[PDB]
Design a protein around this motif. Sequence first.
Motif, PDB file in Angstrom:
ATOM      1  N   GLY A 149      -9.058  61.140   2.380  1.00 55.14           N
ATOM      2  CA  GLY A 149      -7.765  60.436   2.246  1.00 55.14           C
ATOM      3  C   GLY A 149      -6.645  61.129   3.006  1.00 55.14           C
ATOM      4  N   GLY A 150      -5.435  61.159   2.430  1.00 52.52           N
ATOM      5  CA  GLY A 150      -4.278  61.894   2.979  1.00 52.52           C
ATOM      6  C   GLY A 150      -3.826  61.340   4.321  1.00 52.52           C
ATOM      7  N   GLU A 151      -4.173  60.085   4.621  1.00 59.70           N
ATOM      8  CA  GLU A 151      -3.785  59.376   5.868  1.00 59.70           C
ATOM      9  C   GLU A 151      -2.566  58.499   5.584  1.00 59.70           C
ATOM     10  OE1 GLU A 151      -7.320  57.215   7.000  1.00 59.70           O
ATOM     11  OE2 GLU A 151      -8.561  59.034   6.986  1.00 59.70           O
ATOM     12  N   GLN A 152      -1.718  58.278   6.589  1.00 58.66           N
ATOM     13  CA  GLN A 152      -0.609  57.300   6.480  1.00 58.66           C
ATOM     14  C   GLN A 152      -1.223  55.904   6.405  1.00 58.66           C
ATOM     15  OE1 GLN A 152       3.191  57.613   8.619  1.00 58.66           O
ATOM     16  NE2 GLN A 152       2.646  55.640   9.534  1.00 58.66           N
ATOM     17  N   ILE A 153      -0.746  55.095   5.462  1.00 57.36           N
ATOM     18  CA  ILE A 153      -1.196  53.694   5.254  1.00 57.36           C
ATOM     19  C   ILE A 153       0.059  52.837   5.131  1.00 57.36           C
ATOM     20  CG2 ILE A 153      -2.569  52.139   3.826  1.00 57.36           C
ATOM     21  CD1 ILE A 153      -4.277  54.257   5.101  1.00 57.36           C
ATOM     22  N   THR A 154       0.028  51.645   5.719  1.00 56.86           N
ATOM     23  CA  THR A 154       1.074  50.609   5.558  1.00 56.86           C
ATOM     24  C   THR A 154       0.434  49.387   4.902  1.00 56.86           C
ATOM     25  OG1 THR A 154       2.283  51.424   7.462  1.00 56.86           O
ATOM     26  CG2 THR A 154       2.742  49.154   6.779  1.00 56.86           C
ATOM     27  N   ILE A 155       0.838  49.056   3.674  1.00 55.91           N
ATOM     28  CA  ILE A 155       0.488  47.758   3.031  1.00 55.91           C
ATOM     29  C   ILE A 155       1.577  46.770   3.448  1.00 55.91           C
ATOM     30  CG2 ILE A 155      -0.177  46.592   0.898  1.00 55.91           C
ATOM     31  CD1 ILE A 155      -1.902  48.993   1.310  1.00 55.91           C
ATOM     32  N   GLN A 156       1.193  45.616   3.996  1.00 52.17           N
ATOM     33  CA  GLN A 156       2.137  44.608   4.550  1.00 52.17           C
ATOM     34  C   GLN A 156       2.386  43.495   3.529  1.00 52.17           C
ATOM     35  OE1 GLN A 156       0.163  43.738   8.284  1.00 52.17           O
ATOM     36  NE2 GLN A 156       1.663  44.949   9.423  1.00 52.17           N
ATOM     37  N   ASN A 157       3.622  42.992   3.476  1.00 53.09           N
ATOM     38  CA  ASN A 157       3.990  41.731   2.780  1.00 53.09           C
ATOM     39  C   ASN A 157       3.866  41.898   1.262  1.00 53.09           C
ATOM     40  OD1 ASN A 157       4.139  40.884   5.414  1.00 53.09           O
ATOM     41  ND2 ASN A 157       2.331  39.562   5.314  1.00 53.09           N
ATOM     42  N   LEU A 158       4.492  42.932   0.696  1.00 54.71           N
ATOM     43  CA  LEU A 158       4.664  43.065  -0.775  1.00 54.71           C
ATOM     44  C   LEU A 158       5.989  42.410  -1.163  1.00 54.71           C
ATOM     45  CD1 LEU A 158       3.372  46.691  -1.364  1.00 54.71           C
ATOM     46  CD2 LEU A 158       2.141  44.517  -1.321  1.00 54.71           C
ATOM     47  N   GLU A 159       5.972  41.568  -2.194  1.00 57.09           N
ATOM     48  CA  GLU A 159       7.189  40.916  -2.734  1.00 57.09           C
ATOM     49  C   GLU A 159       7.922  41.939  -3.606  1.00 57.09           C
ATOM     50  OE1 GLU A 159       6.581  37.677  -5.436  1.00 57.09           O
ATOM     51  OE2 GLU A 159       8.644  36.941  -5.215  1.00 57.09           O
ATOM     52  N   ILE A 160       9.244  42.045  -3.448  1.00 55.04           N
ATOM     53  CA  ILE A 160      10.139  42.750  -4.413  1.00 55.04           C
ATOM     54  C   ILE A 160      10.377  41.806  -5.595  1.00 55.04           C
ATOM     55  CG2 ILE A 160      12.494  43.603  -4.752  1.00 55.04           C
ATOM     56  CD1 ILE A 160      12.350  44.882  -2.041  1.00 55.04           C
ATOM     57  N   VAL A 161      10.061  42.269  -6.808  1.00 58.76           N
ATOM     58  CA  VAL A 161      10.036  41.443  -8.052  1.00 58.76           C
ATOM     59  C   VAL A 161      11.366  41.608  -8.790  1.00 58.76           C
ATOM     60  CG1 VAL A 161       8.887  41.123 -10.292  1.00 58.76           C
ATOM     61  CG2 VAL A 161       7.519  41.565  -8.258  1.00 58.76           C
ATOM     62  N   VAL A 182      16.012  51.600  -8.959  1.00 59.57           N
ATOM     63  CA  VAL A 182      14.580  51.212  -9.101  1.00 59.57           C
ATOM     64  C   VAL A 182      14.333  49.901  -8.348  1.00 59.57           C
ATOM     65  CG1 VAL A 182      12.991  50.235 -10.843  1.00 59.57           C
ATOM     66  CG2 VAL A 182      14.014  52.486 -11.201  1.00 59.57           C
ATOM     67  N   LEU A 183      13.296  49.887  -7.505  1.00 61.09           N
ATOM     68  CA  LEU A 183      12.637  48.668  -6.973  1.00 61.09           C
ATOM     69  C   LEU A 183      11.342  48.460  -7.757  1.00 61.09           C
ATOM     70  CD1 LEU A 183      12.995  48.990  -3.096  1.00 61.09           C
ATOM     71  CD2 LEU A 183      14.305  47.586  -4.697  1.00 61.09           C
ATOM     72  N   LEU A 184      11.065  47.226  -8.174  1.00 60.05           N
ATOM     73  CA  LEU A 184       9.718  46.813  -8.635  1.00 60.05           C
ATOM     74  C   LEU A 184       9.087  46.018  -7.496  1.00 60.05           C
ATOM     75  CD1 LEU A 184       9.880  45.989 -12.419  1.00 60.05           C
ATOM     76  CD2 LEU A 184      10.038  48.148 -11.168  1.00 60.05           C
ATOM     77  N   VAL A 185       7.935  46.477  -7.014  1.00 58.83           N
ATOM     78  CA  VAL A 185       7.186  45.855  -5.890  1.00 58.83           C
ATOM     79  C   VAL A 185       5.892  45.287  -6.468  1.00 58.83           C
ATOM     80  CG1 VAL A 185       6.050  46.351  -3.682  1.00 58.83           C
ATOM     81  CG2 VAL A 185       8.216  47.466  -4.245  1.00 58.83           C
ATOM     82  N   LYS A 186       5.608  44.006  -6.228  1.00 58.01           N
ATOM     83  CA  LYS A 186       4.349  43.383  -6.709  1.00 58.01           C
ATOM     84  C   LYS A 186       3.171  44.136  -6.085  1.00 58.01           C
ATOM     85  CE  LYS A 186       1.695  39.085  -7.045  1.00 58.01           C
ATOM     86  NZ  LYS A 186       1.500  37.735  -6.468  1.00 58.01           N
ATOM     87  N   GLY A 187       2.154  44.440  -6.891  1.00 56.30           N
ATOM     88  CA  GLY A 187       0.932  45.120  -6.431  1.00 56.30           C
ATOM     89  C   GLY A 187       1.153  46.612  -6.280  1.00 56.30           C
TER      90      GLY A 187
END
Lengths: 36, 142, 165, 206
Positions: D164-176, D184-189
């Motif tokens: 692990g320990g790699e940079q990852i970008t998850i795309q298209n998360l909705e702010i809830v 505080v931000l709540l991000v779906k998923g």
Amino acid sequence: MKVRPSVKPMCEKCKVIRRKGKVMVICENPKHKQKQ
Amino acid sequence: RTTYMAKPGEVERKWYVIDATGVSLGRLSSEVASILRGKNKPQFTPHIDTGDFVIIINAGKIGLTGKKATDKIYYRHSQYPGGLKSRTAGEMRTNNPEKLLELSIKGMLPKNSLGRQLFKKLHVYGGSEHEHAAQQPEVYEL
Amino acid sequence: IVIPAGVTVTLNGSTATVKGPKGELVKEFNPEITIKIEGNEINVSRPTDNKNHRALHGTTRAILNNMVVGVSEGYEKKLELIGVGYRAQKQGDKLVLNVGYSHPVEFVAPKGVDIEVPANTQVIVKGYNKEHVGELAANIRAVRPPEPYKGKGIRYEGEHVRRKE
Amino acid sequence: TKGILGRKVGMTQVFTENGELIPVTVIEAAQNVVLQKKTVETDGYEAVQIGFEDKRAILSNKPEQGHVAKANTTPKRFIREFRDVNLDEYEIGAEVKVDVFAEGDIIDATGVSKGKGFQGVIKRHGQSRGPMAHGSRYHRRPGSMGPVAPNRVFKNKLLPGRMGGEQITIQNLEIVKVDVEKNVLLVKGNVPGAKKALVQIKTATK
RNA sequence: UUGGCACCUCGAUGUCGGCUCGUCGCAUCCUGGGGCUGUAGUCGGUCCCAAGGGUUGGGCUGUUCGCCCAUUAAAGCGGCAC
RNA sequence: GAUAAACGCUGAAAGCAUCUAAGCGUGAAGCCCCCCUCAAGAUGAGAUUUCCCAUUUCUUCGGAAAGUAAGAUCCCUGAAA
Ligand SMILES: [Mg+2]
Ligand SMILES: [Mg+2]
Ligand SMILES: [Mg+2]
Ligand SMILES: [Mg+2]
Ligand SMILES: [Mg+2]
Ligand SMILES: [Mg+2]
Ligand SMILES: [Mg+2]
Ligand SMILES: [Mg+2]
Ligand SMILES: [Mg+2]
Ligand SMILES: [Mg+2]
Ligand SMILES: [Mg+2]
Ligand SMILES: [Zn+2]
């Protein structure tokens, strides 16, 4: 389009031309389209 | 015996600026290789580097005869399976002309440590402006 | 090549500008082929009898003729929609065709070309640059070219479509 | 395009107005300050440099102190650049609050994935085991290193190594949800990293 | 592929099928683009461009192959010491 | 964005015709971008911001060594590693 090494007039209307260094016959009859 | 041998930093290395405009990519390259190697000087010594520094300007206007613009392909392999990339001489003259002339000239230099030092003496520019005015470059004709 | 009344033809090195009543044109020709501009008539000169020059000669003549005739009476390519529910509406600068697709197809004319639509069944393309007229006219025909079974679709007015069962 | 830096607090769930139940990641993003604006004239590209969490003086050095002194702020734990932002927004020393986002905003979460250490081809590359019975002596091994002809192994023969320990970008998360007073931000998923991991939240590139 | 030859290897170059891991070619199985059609439509046929990705699970047999069952957009053909 | 096959426009050579020779356009899951990750040992070793400052004795000479600055490490408590 007929693609074949032997390209030649199939009727009197068939015209032999060259486009982009490729011999071809064009004709009113679309069946007679040929490219070498 | 008695044959002269140049020492490092003995022969005065000069700065030349050469306009590439309308000259065949080869023809320009082959002449520049000779200047870099020092073949034009009687002090020429095969193990020393007695050659001059060369600035090439207007490399974007370099000549490619026939259909070389579209048909001369430059290949690179990453060494990964199926990692062969290709560029046309034309596309590379438009976008990376500094690269085009460097490839062309690198091929005409000795394939050794001294050959790699000679390549460092070559400065290629797409346009008419370099930033080596301090080195007081003298215009050279082919 | 005769120059009509109102036309002024000028040559700047190789290129030749032509400004008339209908519009204004600029076209760059091959240098070695020379053009002798006179007040009434235009005679294009060929230096050698090499295949390259024989071709360019007739082209420089043809295009210059087209340019001059271009700015005089203008060029008109006429199109004719066939088939039930095939119509064309002119709204602003946009030609909106309904040629049987689920969406309508729209064309905005370039600089120097017009698409006035007398009847809904036919279209006419006016301009001075014949190649610009030709292309737009072809591009509109490209949407629904004539099919060979009932002849439906956009055809040129003089066009002859092959027919089948 | 808007961006902020927060720590991953953890995961929970929230009931939507609809009545549906969605998993969320809680990102706490307090103490974001604009430290430096990079321009084409100065650095050759447009970017705003944001400093995230306040850090005790003794944990900073004189180089760091000088950099945040230009923005009249204290040393910062995390400093990251955001490109594709509008530099007309952002003044040097300005706080960057989570209200730069709103409910429904689609964001891209970037972080460093959890460390799994040395891992074999089964976990690291999802390769198949050999048979576990029927005389098999091949179980969690990498498979043939390749054909004979090229007296060598090709360059992407996947093998064991640090996972692990790699940079990852998850795309298209909705702010809830966006709670300003709690930063505080709540991000779906879910977003990459362990709890307390740095998370870079910016407007979705797509 | 079936073969011919006997040039490397007999002080050993392990030989079928399977598994694991693939990678390459394109003479393309699917998907993309297109010409001709004895192309009305829906389906097809045939040729051209295209190798990006994809290209199933079972019954029988050591099998490869093949037949079969049930799917699938498709169940490609080859090379890499078969 | 540029192209393949293909379709055209204008257009002569070859008073016609012709997508092609000069010249314009359309046009693929493919090419190059766009997306994600690594990446200046990219020895061609890049850039920006910030910090430390020009010490001592020698070395004819070039240079050398020996306390330091900013900073880092050893050592120690550890885990999200
Ligand atoms: Mg771990
Ligand atoms: Mg399995
Ligand atoms: Mg076992
Ligand atoms: Mg080898
Ligand atoms: Mg014998
Ligand atoms: Mg032996
Ligand atoms: Mg093929
Ligand atoms: Mg074998
Ligand atoms: Mg024509
Ligand atoms: Mg295009
Ligand atoms: Mg797709
Ligand atoms: Zn015929």
